[PDB]
């Protein structure tokens, strides 16, 4: 019942920071077909829009 | 005799747990921030206007004294 505040602090540090966004946005873009073919799973699939969760 | 006793939740369950993202907006408009910046710039400009004019007068006075002492 106290962990959500920790996640919120992490987001305060990261989610809206311009340096973090410039470091992560548009980096390592993979298409859904390429992700499916290369054998990716989990977030690496769901980051490309694939709706799949075991 | 004794009934079973193992780790179980209390009757009625546990209290609700927060999981939604909580990123409150502190609150100040961009217009307001720009207005504050411009206002403090203008106040500094006026104060330094006055001080620099006074400094010009002081320098002129020092030059007057030097001119008087020169011969």
mmCIF file of N, CA and C in Angstrom:
data_model
loop_
_atom_site.group_PDB
_atom_site.id
_atom_site.type_symbol
_atom_site.label_atom_id
_atom_site.label_comp_id
_atom_site.label_asym_id
_atom_site.label_seq_id
_atom_site.Cartn_x
_atom_site.Cartn_y
_atom_site.Cartn_z
ATOM 1 N N UNK A 1 0.807 -1.212 0.000
ATOM 2 C CA UNK A 1 0.000 0.000 0.000
ATOM 3 C C UNK A 1 0.844 1.267 0.000
ATOM 4 N N UNK A 2 2.168 1.139 -0.054
ATOM 5 C CA UNK A 2 3.066 2.282 -0.093
ATOM 6 C C UNK A 2 3.926 2.320 -1.350
ATOM 7 N N UNK A 3 3.852 1.294 -2.201
ATOM 8 C CA UNK A 3 4.765 1.189 -3.334
ATOM 9 C C UNK A 3 4.388 2.133 -4.473
ATOM 10 N N UNK A 4 3.102 2.468 -4.600
ATOM 11 C CA UNK A 4 2.674 3.347 -5.682
ATOM 12 C C UNK A 4 3.325 4.719 -5.577
ATOM 13 N N UNK A 5 3.535 5.216 -4.357
ATOM 14 C CA UNK A 5 4.257 6.472 -4.191
ATOM 15 C C UNK A 5 5.701 6.359 -4.664
ATOM 16 N N UNK A 6 6.338 5.207 -4.449
ATOM 17 C CA UNK A 6 7.690 5.005 -4.961
ATOM 18 C C UNK A 6 7.710 5.013 -6.484
ATOM 19 N N UNK A 7 6.732 4.353 -7.112
ATOM 20 C CA UNK A 7 6.637 4.399 -8.570
ATOM 21 C C UNK A 7 6.410 5.830 -9.043
ATOM 22 N N UNK A 8 5.594 6.586 -8.307
ATOM 23 C CA UNK A 8 5.331 7.974 -8.671
ATOM 24 C C UNK A 8 6.596 8.817 -8.584
ATOM 25 N N UNK A 9 7.412 8.599 -7.551
ATOM 26 C CA UNK A 9 8.684 9.312 -7.449
ATOM 27 C C UNK A 9 9.614 8.949 -8.600
ATOM 28 N N UNK A 10 9.657 7.666 -8.964
ATOM 29 C CA UNK A 10 10.457 7.253 -10.114
ATOM 30 C C UNK A 10 10.004 7.972 -11.381
ATOM 31 N N UNK A 11 8.688 8.060 -11.587
ATOM 32 C CA UNK A 11 8.174 8.763 -12.759
ATOM 33 C C UNK A 11 8.500 10.253 -12.705
ATOM 34 N N UNK A 12 8.351 10.875 -11.532
ATOM 35 C CA UNK A 12 8.774 12.263 -11.360
ATOM 36 C C UNK A 12 10.212 12.454 -11.811
ATOM 37 N N UNK A 13 11.076 11.495 -11.492
ATOM 38 C CA UNK A 13 12.463 11.587 -11.920
ATOM 39 C C UNK A 13 12.656 11.321 -13.407
ATOM 40 N N UNK A 14 11.808 10.505 -14.030
ATOM 41 C CA UNK A 14 12.130 10.014 -15.365
ATOM 42 C C UNK A 14 11.139 10.400 -16.455
ATOM 43 N N UNK A 15 9.830 10.247 -16.229
ATOM 44 C CA UNK A 15 8.893 10.162 -17.351
ATOM 45 C C UNK A 15 8.837 11.459 -18.159
ATOM 46 N N UNK A 16 8.907 12.610 -17.495
ATOM 47 C CA UNK A 16 8.772 13.891 -18.178
ATOM 48 C C UNK A 16 10.096 14.620 -18.365
ATOM 49 N N UNK A 17 11.207 14.034 -17.930
ATOM 50 C CA UNK A 17 12.504 14.673 -18.096
ATOM 51 C C UNK A 17 12.871 14.729 -19.574
ATOM 52 N N UNK A 18 13.302 15.905 -20.035
ATOM 53 C CA UNK A 18 13.638 16.055 -21.447
ATOM 54 C C UNK A 18 14.900 15.286 -21.813
ATOM 55 N N UNK A 19 15.861 15.180 -20.892
ATOM 56 C CA UNK A 19 17.070 14.413 -21.173
ATOM 57 C C UNK A 19 16.741 12.931 -21.320
ATOM 58 N N UNK A 20 15.911 12.399 -20.419
ATOM 59 C CA UNK A 20 15.523 10.994 -20.496
ATOM 60 C C UNK A 20 14.736 10.712 -21.770
ATOM 61 N N UNK A 21 13.810 11.609 -22.118
ATOM 62 C CA UNK A 21 13.032 11.454 -23.343
ATOM 63 C C UNK A 21 13.927 11.497 -24.575
ATOM 64 N N UNK A 22 14.865 12.444 -24.618
ATOM 65 C CA UNK A 22 15.798 12.509 -25.736
ATOM 66 C C UNK A 22 16.701 11.289 -25.801
ATOM 67 N N UNK A 23 16.994 10.667 -24.660
ATOM 68 C CA UNK A 23 17.807 9.459 -24.660
ATOM 69 C C UNK A 23 17.029 8.236 -25.126
ATOM 70 N N UNK A 24 15.726 8.170 -24.839
ATOM 71 C CA UNK A 24 14.967 6.950 -25.082
ATOM 72 C C UNK A 24 14.017 7.010 -26.271
ATOM 73 N N UNK A 25 13.441 8.167 -26.584
ATOM 74 C CA UNK A 25 12.458 8.262 -27.661
ATOM 75 C C UNK A 25 13.137 8.076 -29.011
ATOM 76 N N UNK A 26 12.497 7.283 -29.877
ATOM 77 C CA UNK A 26 12.966 7.011 -31.238
ATOM 78 C C UNK A 26 14.309 6.294 -31.246
ATOM 79 N N UNK A 27 14.546 5.454 -30.244
ATOM 80 C CA UNK A 27 15.755 4.649 -30.151
ATOM 81 C C UNK A 27 15.343 3.186 -30.169
ATOM 82 N N UNK A 28 16.003 2.395 -31.010
ATOM 83 C CA UNK A 28 15.707 0.981 -31.106
ATOM 84 C C UNK A 28 14.290 0.680 -31.543
ATOM 85 N N UNK A 29 13.818 1.362 -32.586
ATOM 86 C CA UNK A 29 12.469 1.122 -33.082
ATOM 87 C C UNK A 29 12.436 -0.204 -33.829
ATOM 88 N N UNK A 30 11.491 -1.063 -33.459
ATOM 89 C CA UNK A 30 11.304 -2.356 -34.104
ATOM 90 C C UNK A 30 9.850 -2.474 -34.540
ATOM 91 N N UNK A 31 9.643 -2.947 -35.765
ATOM 92 C CA UNK A 31 8.295 -3.121 -36.278
ATOM 93 C C UNK A 31 7.676 -4.402 -35.726
ATOM 94 N N UNK A 32 6.343 -4.452 -35.767
ATOM 95 C CA UNK A 32 5.625 -5.596 -35.214
ATOM 96 C C UNK A 32 5.977 -6.885 -35.945
ATOM 97 N N UNK A 33 6.035 -6.837 -37.278
ATOM 98 C CA UNK A 33 6.386 -8.030 -38.041
ATOM 99 C C UNK A 33 7.815 -8.472 -37.752
ATOM 100 N N UNK A 34 8.747 -7.518 -37.676
ATOM 101 C CA UNK A 34 10.131 -7.858 -37.359
ATOM 102 C C UNK A 34 10.248 -8.439 -35.957
ATOM 103 N N UNK A 35 9.534 -7.855 -34.992
ATOM 104 C CA UNK A 35 9.561 -8.376 -33.629
ATOM 105 C C UNK A 35 9.004 -9.791 -33.568
ATOM 106 N N UNK A 36 7.902 -10.047 -34.276
ATOM 107 C CA UNK A 36 7.329 -11.389 -34.293
ATOM 108 C C UNK A 36 8.269 -12.388 -34.954
ATOM 109 N N UNK A 37 8.916 -11.993 -36.053
ATOM 110 C CA UNK A 37 9.786 -12.926 -36.762
ATOM 111 C C UNK A 37 11.053 -13.225 -35.970
ATOM 112 N N UNK A 38 11.669 -12.199 -35.381
ATOM 113 C CA UNK A 38 12.942 -12.377 -34.693
ATOM 114 C C UNK A 38 12.814 -13.162 -33.395
ATOM 115 N N UNK A 39 11.598 -13.444 -32.940
ATOM 116 C CA UNK A 39 11.408 -14.241 -31.748
ATOM 117 C C UNK A 39 11.245 -13.458 -30.470
ATOM 118 N N UNK A 40 10.950 -12.166 -30.556
ATOM 119 C CA UNK A 40 10.805 -11.349 -29.363
ATOM 120 C C UNK A 40 9.549 -11.747 -28.593
ATOM 121 N N UNK A 41 9.509 -11.349 -27.325
ATOM 122 C CA UNK A 41 8.393 -11.693 -26.458
ATOM 123 C C UNK A 41 8.303 -10.665 -25.341
ATOM 124 N N UNK A 42 7.145 -10.633 -24.690
ATOM 125 C CA UNK A 42 6.960 -9.712 -23.581
ATOM 126 C C UNK A 42 6.870 -8.274 -24.052
ATOM 127 N N UNK A 43 7.532 -7.384 -23.307
ATOM 128 C CA UNK A 43 7.476 -5.955 -23.603
ATOM 129 C C UNK A 43 7.980 -5.674 -25.010
ATOM 130 N N UNK A 44 9.026 -6.384 -25.441
ATOM 131 C CA UNK A 44 9.576 -6.173 -26.775
ATOM 132 C C UNK A 44 8.531 -6.393 -27.860
ATOM 133 N N UNK A 45 7.512 -7.203 -27.583
ATOM 134 C CA UNK A 45 6.363 -7.288 -28.472
ATOM 135 C C UNK A 45 5.366 -6.171 -28.193
ATOM 136 N N UNK A 46 5.006 -5.990 -26.920
ATOM 137 C CA UNK A 46 3.941 -5.063 -26.557
ATOM 138 C C UNK A 46 4.340 -3.611 -26.758
ATOM 139 N N UNK A 47 5.638 -3.322 -26.857
ATOM 140 C CA UNK A 47 6.063 -1.985 -27.220
ATOM 141 C C UNK A 47 5.773 -1.630 -28.661
ATOM 142 N N UNK A 48 5.615 -2.632 -29.523
ATOM 143 C CA UNK A 48 5.319 -2.412 -30.929
ATOM 144 C C UNK A 48 3.830 -2.474 -31.239
ATOM 145 N N UNK A 49 2.975 -2.532 -30.220
ATOM 146 C CA UNK A 49 1.542 -2.560 -30.417
ATOM 147 C C UNK A 49 0.918 -3.936 -30.448
ATOM 148 N N UNK A 50 1.716 -4.998 -30.344
ATOM 149 C CA UNK A 50 1.173 -6.349 -30.374
ATOM 150 C C UNK A 50 0.471 -6.643 -29.056
ATOM 151 N N UNK A 51 -0.785 -7.075 -29.140
ATOM 152 C CA UNK A 51 -1.596 -7.357 -27.957
ATOM 153 C C UNK A 51 -1.447 -8.835 -27.624
ATOM 154 N N UNK A 52 -0.442 -9.148 -26.808
ATOM 155 C CA UNK A 52 -0.129 -10.530 -26.470
ATOM 156 C C UNK A 52 0.435 -10.585 -25.059
ATOM 157 N N UNK A 53 -0.203 -11.377 -24.201
ATOM 158 C CA UNK A 53 0.272 -11.589 -22.838
ATOM 159 C C UNK A 53 -0.123 -12.996 -22.422
ATOM 160 N N UNK A 54 0.869 -13.815 -22.066
ATOM 161 C CA UNK A 54 0.607 -15.217 -21.759
ATOM 162 C C UNK A 54 -0.270 -15.400 -20.528
ATOM 163 N N UNK B 1 -9.615 -30.954 18.824
ATOM 164 C CA UNK B 1 -9.951 -29.870 19.740
ATOM 165 C C UNK B 1 -9.692 -28.512 19.096
ATOM 166 N N UNK B 2 -8.419 -28.139 19.006
ATOM 167 C CA UNK B 2 -8.051 -26.866 18.403
ATOM 168 C C UNK B 2 -8.348 -26.874 16.909
ATOM 169 N N UNK B 3 -8.898 -25.768 16.419
ATOM 170 C CA UNK B 3 -9.177 -25.626 15.001
ATOM 171 C C UNK B 3 -7.909 -25.229 14.247
ATOM 172 N N UNK B 4 -7.997 -25.266 12.917
ATOM 173 C CA UNK B 4 -6.850 -24.922 12.086
ATOM 174 C C UNK B 4 -6.539 -23.437 12.224
ATOM 175 N N UNK B 5 -5.248 -23.112 12.244
ATOM 176 C CA UNK B 5 -4.784 -21.734 12.380
ATOM 177 C C UNK B 5 -3.616 -21.534 11.426
ATOM 178 N N UNK B 6 -3.862 -20.844 10.317
ATOM 179 C CA UNK B 6 -2.815 -20.550 9.352
ATOM 180 C C UNK B 6 -2.970 -19.113 8.876
ATOM 181 N N UNK B 7 -1.951 -18.637 8.165
ATOM 182 C CA UNK B 7 -1.907 -17.252 7.707
ATOM 183 C C UNK B 7 -3.029 -17.006 6.709
ATOM 184 N N UNK B 8 -4.012 -16.215 7.110
ATOM 185 C CA UNK B 8 -5.165 -15.876 6.293
ATOM 186 C C UNK B 8 -5.430 -14.383 6.390
ATOM 187 N N UNK B 9 -6.082 -13.800 5.382
ATOM 188 C CA UNK B 9 -6.443 -12.389 5.474
ATOM 189 C C UNK B 9 -7.483 -12.169 6.559
ATOM 190 N N UNK B 10 -7.543 -10.966 7.135
ATOM 191 C CA UNK B 10 -8.543 -10.706 8.167
ATOM 192 C C UNK B 10 -9.935 -10.678 7.567
ATOM 193 N N UNK B 11 -10.974 -10.894 8.374
ATOM 194 C CA UNK B 11 -12.340 -10.853 7.841
ATOM 195 C C UNK B 11 -12.656 -9.500 7.221
ATOM 196 N N UNK B 12 -13.347 -9.538 6.086
ATOM 197 C CA UNK B 12 -13.680 -8.335 5.356
ATOM 198 C C UNK B 12 -12.611 -7.829 4.416
ATOM 199 N N UNK B 13 -11.467 -8.505 4.415
ATOM 200 C CA UNK B 13 -10.357 -8.182 3.544
ATOM 201 C C UNK B 13 -9.470 -7.047 3.999
ATOM 202 N N UNK B 14 -8.429 -6.805 3.216
ATOM 203 C CA UNK B 14 -7.491 -5.726 3.467
ATOM 204 C C UNK B 14 -8.012 -4.417 2.897
ATOM 205 N N UNK B 15 -7.439 -3.311 3.355
ATOM 206 C CA UNK B 15 -7.808 -1.993 2.872
ATOM 207 C C UNK B 15 -7.384 -1.823 1.424
ATOM 208 N N UNK B 16 -8.112 -0.994 0.668
ATOM 209 C CA UNK B 16 -7.795 -0.814 -0.752
ATOM 210 C C UNK B 16 -6.391 -0.269 -0.970
ATOM 211 N N UNK B 17 -5.735 -0.763 -2.012
ATOM 212 C CA UNK B 17 -4.377 -0.358 -2.339
ATOM 213 C C UNK B 17 -4.334 0.503 -3.595
ATOM 214 N N UNK B 18 -3.665 1.645 -3.489
ATOM 215 C CA UNK B 18 -3.508 2.571 -4.599
ATOM 216 C C UNK B 18 -2.500 2.031 -5.603
ATOM 217 N N UNK B 19 -2.857 2.086 -6.885
ATOM 218 C CA UNK B 19 -1.931 1.715 -7.946
ATOM 219 C C UNK B 19 -1.918 2.682 -9.117
ATOM 220 N N UNK B 20 -2.897 3.575 -9.239
ATOM 221 C CA UNK B 20 -2.921 4.533 -10.333
ATOM 222 C C UNK B 20 -1.762 5.516 -10.224
ATOM 223 N N UNK B 21 -1.262 5.942 -11.381
ATOM 224 C CA UNK B 21 -0.216 6.954 -11.416
ATOM 225 C C UNK B 21 -0.730 8.261 -10.832
ATOM 226 N N UNK B 22 0.080 8.883 -9.976
ATOM 227 C CA UNK B 22 -0.278 10.131 -9.303
ATOM 228 C C UNK B 22 0.822 11.147 -9.595
ATOM 229 N N UNK B 23 0.596 11.982 -10.610
ATOM 230 C CA UNK B 23 1.530 13.035 -11.008
ATOM 231 C C UNK B 23 0.772 14.355 -10.990
ATOM 232 N N UNK B 24 0.601 14.967 -9.821
ATOM 233 C CA UNK B 24 -0.183 16.202 -9.739
ATOM 234 C C UNK B 24 0.480 17.347 -10.488
ATOM 235 N N UNK B 25 -0.362 18.257 -10.969
ATOM 236 C CA UNK B 25 0.084 19.459 -11.663
ATOM 237 C C UNK B 25 0.191 20.580 -10.636
ATOM 238 N N UNK B 26 1.407 21.104 -10.459
ATOM 239 C CA UNK B 26 1.639 22.127 -9.442
ATOM 240 C C UNK B 26 0.794 23.366 -9.710
ATOM 241 N N UNK B 27 0.848 23.882 -10.934
ATOM 242 C CA UNK B 27 -0.057 24.930 -11.358
ATOM 243 C C UNK B 27 0.552 26.312 -11.475
ATOM 244 N N UNK B 28 0.958 26.676 -12.691
ATOM 245 C CA UNK B 28 1.332 28.044 -13.026
ATOM 246 C C UNK B 28 1.408 28.171 -14.543
ATOM 247 N N UNK B 29 0.676 29.124 -15.113
ATOM 248 C CA UNK B 29 0.568 29.209 -16.561
ATOM 249 C C UNK B 29 1.860 29.740 -17.177
ATOM 250 N N UNK B 30 2.088 29.358 -18.436
ATOM 251 C CA UNK B 30 3.239 29.876 -19.160
ATOM 252 C C UNK B 30 3.184 31.380 -19.333
ATOM 253 N N UNK B 31 1.982 31.918 -19.550
ATOM 254 C CA UNK B 31 1.811 33.365 -19.596
ATOM 255 C C UNK B 31 2.262 34.003 -18.290
ATOM 256 N N UNK B 32 1.873 33.408 -17.160
ATOM 257 C CA UNK B 32 2.258 33.950 -15.861
ATOM 258 C C UNK B 32 3.768 33.901 -15.661
ATOM 259 N N UNK B 33 4.405 32.796 -16.059
ATOM 260 C CA UNK B 33 5.851 32.674 -15.897
ATOM 261 C C UNK B 33 6.585 33.705 -16.747
ATOM 262 N N UNK B 34 6.156 33.864 -18.001
ATOM 263 C CA UNK B 34 6.768 34.868 -18.862
ATOM 264 C C UNK B 34 6.543 36.271 -18.312
ATOM 265 N N UNK B 35 5.355 36.530 -17.760
ATOM 266 C CA UNK B 35 5.075 37.835 -17.173
ATOM 267 C C UNK B 35 5.979 38.109 -15.978
ATOM 268 N N UNK B 36 6.199 37.102 -15.131
ATOM 269 C CA UNK B 36 7.088 37.275 -13.985
ATOM 270 C C UNK B 36 8.509 37.567 -14.452
ATOM 271 N N UNK B 37 8.976 36.832 -15.465
ATOM 272 C CA UNK B 37 10.308 37.088 -15.992
ATOM 273 C C UNK B 37 10.457 38.494 -16.547
ATOM 274 N N UNK B 38 9.474 38.935 -17.334
ATOM 275 C CA UNK B 38 9.536 40.274 -17.914
ATOM 276 C C UNK B 38 9.472 41.335 -16.822
ATOM 277 N N UNK B 39 8.645 41.113 -15.800
ATOM 278 C CA UNK B 39 8.532 42.089 -14.729
ATOM 279 C C UNK B 39 9.818 42.239 -13.939
ATOM 280 N N UNK B 40 10.457 41.114 -13.602
ATOM 281 C CA UNK B 40 11.719 41.213 -12.877
ATOM 282 C C UNK B 40 12.813 41.824 -13.750
ATOM 283 N N UNK B 41 12.808 41.532 -15.057
ATOM 284 C CA UNK B 41 13.752 42.193 -15.954
ATOM 285 C C UNK B 41 13.544 43.701 -15.963
ATOM 286 N N UNK B 42 12.287 44.147 -16.039
ATOM 287 C CA UNK B 42 12.008 45.581 -16.074
ATOM 288 C C UNK B 42 12.411 46.259 -14.769
ATOM 289 N N UNK B 43 12.139 45.614 -13.634
ATOM 290 C CA UNK B 43 12.531 46.190 -12.352
ATOM 291 C C UNK B 43 14.047 46.324 -12.253
ATOM 292 N N UNK B 44 14.777 45.279 -12.656
ATOM 293 C CA UNK B 44 16.228 45.372 -12.673
ATOM 294 C C UNK B 44 16.728 46.460 -13.601
ATOM 295 N N UNK B 45 16.107 46.586 -14.777
ATOM 296 C CA UNK B 45 16.506 47.615 -15.730
ATOM 297 C C UNK B 45 16.344 49.005 -15.133
ATOM 298 N N UNK B 46 15.214 49.253 -14.467
ATOM 299 C CA UNK B 46 14.976 50.573 -13.887
ATOM 300 C C UNK B 46 15.960 50.872 -12.758
ATOM 301 N N UNK B 47 16.171 49.898 -11.865
ATOM 302 C CA UNK B 47 17.101 50.110 -10.760
ATOM 303 C C UNK B 47 18.509 50.387 -11.272
ATOM 304 N N UNK B 48 18.947 49.634 -12.283
ATOM 305 C CA UNK B 48 20.289 49.837 -12.810
ATOM 306 C C UNK B 48 20.381 51.129 -13.611
ATOM 307 N N UNK B 49 19.281 51.555 -14.238
ATOM 308 C CA UNK B 49 19.217 52.883 -14.844
ATOM 309 C C UNK B 49 19.581 53.952 -13.827
ATOM 310 N N UNK B 50 18.875 53.941 -12.696
ATOM 311 C CA UNK B 50 19.094 54.956 -11.670
ATOM 312 C C UNK B 50 20.520 54.890 -11.134
ATOM 313 N N UNK B 51 20.992 53.676 -10.832
ATOM 314 C CA UNK B 51 22.319 53.539 -10.243
ATOM 315 C C UNK B 51 23.412 53.970 -11.216
ATOM 316 N N UNK B 52 23.262 53.644 -12.503
ATOM 317 C CA UNK B 52 24.286 54.006 -13.475
ATOM 318 C C UNK B 52 24.309 55.509 -13.723
ATOM 319 N N UNK B 53 23.145 56.165 -13.711
ATOM 320 C CA UNK B 53 23.156 57.624 -13.814
ATOM 321 C C UNK B 53 23.852 58.257 -12.612
ATOM 322 N N UNK B 54 23.584 57.739 -11.410
ATOM 323 C CA UNK B 54 24.282 58.249 -10.231
ATOM 324 C C UNK B 54 25.788 58.026 -10.343
ATOM 325 N N UNK B 55 26.196 56.872 -10.875
ATOM 326 C CA UNK B 55 27.618 56.598 -11.056
ATOM 327 C C UNK B 55 28.244 57.553 -12.064
ATOM 328 N N UNK B 56 27.506 57.898 -13.124
ATOM 329 C CA UNK B 56 28.001 58.892 -14.072
ATOM 330 C C UNK B 56 28.236 60.228 -13.384
ATOM 331 N N UNK B 57 27.293 60.648 -12.539
ATOM 332 C CA UNK B 57 27.472 61.906 -11.817
ATOM 333 C C UNK B 57 28.689 61.852 -10.897
ATOM 334 N N UNK B 58 28.875 60.729 -10.200
ATOM 335 C CA UNK B 58 30.027 60.591 -9.309
ATOM 336 C C UNK B 58 31.343 60.646 -10.080
ATOM 337 N N UNK B 59 31.402 59.970 -11.230
ATOM 338 C CA UNK B 59 32.608 60.010 -12.049
ATOM 339 C C UNK B 59 32.889 61.422 -12.541
ATOM 340 N N UNK B 60 31.840 62.150 -12.930
ATOM 341 C CA UNK B 60 32.026 63.532 -13.363
ATOM 342 C C UNK B 60 32.578 64.379 -12.222
ATOM 343 N N UNK B 61 32.099 64.148 -10.997
ATOM 344 C CA UNK B 61 32.619 64.898 -9.852
ATOM 345 C C UNK B 61 34.100 64.604 -9.619
ATOM 346 N N UNK B 62 34.485 63.328 -9.710
ATOM 347 C CA UNK B 62 35.896 62.977 -9.562
ATOM 348 C C UNK B 62 36.743 63.642 -10.641
ATOM 349 N N UNK B 63 36.231 63.675 -11.874
ATOM 350 C CA UNK B 63 36.951 64.330 -12.960
ATOM 351 C C UNK B 63 37.081 65.826 -12.704
ATOM 352 N N UNK B 64 36.040 66.438 -12.133
ATOM 353 C CA UNK B 64 36.101 67.855 -11.787
ATOM 354 C C UNK B 64 37.213 68.111 -10.779
ATOM 355 N N UNK B 65 37.307 67.255 -9.760
ATOM 356 C CA UNK B 65 38.355 67.411 -8.753
ATOM 357 C C UNK B 65 39.742 67.267 -9.374
ATOM 358 N N UNK B 66 39.908 66.282 -10.261
ATOM 359 C CA UNK B 66 41.200 66.111 -10.921
ATOM 360 C C UNK B 66 41.555 67.330 -11.764
ATOM 361 N N UNK B 67 40.573 67.880 -12.481
ATOM 362 C CA UNK B 67 40.807 69.072 -13.290
ATOM 363 C C UNK B 67 41.234 70.237 -12.407
ATOM 364 N N UNK B 68 40.586 70.389 -11.251
ATOM 365 C CA UNK B 68 40.967 71.455 -10.329
ATOM 366 C C UNK B 68 42.398 71.280 -9.836
ATOM 367 N N UNK B 69 42.804 70.041 -9.556
ATOM 368 C CA UNK B 69 44.148 69.802 -9.037
ATOM 369 C C UNK B 69 45.238 69.847 -10.106
ATOM 370 N N UNK B 70 44.878 69.722 -11.386
ATOM 371 C CA UNK B 70 45.883 69.523 -12.433
ATOM 372 C C UNK B 70 46.952 70.612 -12.531
ATOM 373 N N UNK B 71 46.630 71.918 -12.535
ATOM 374 C CA UNK B 71 47.684 72.917 -12.812
ATOM 375 C C UNK B 71 48.861 72.883 -11.848
#
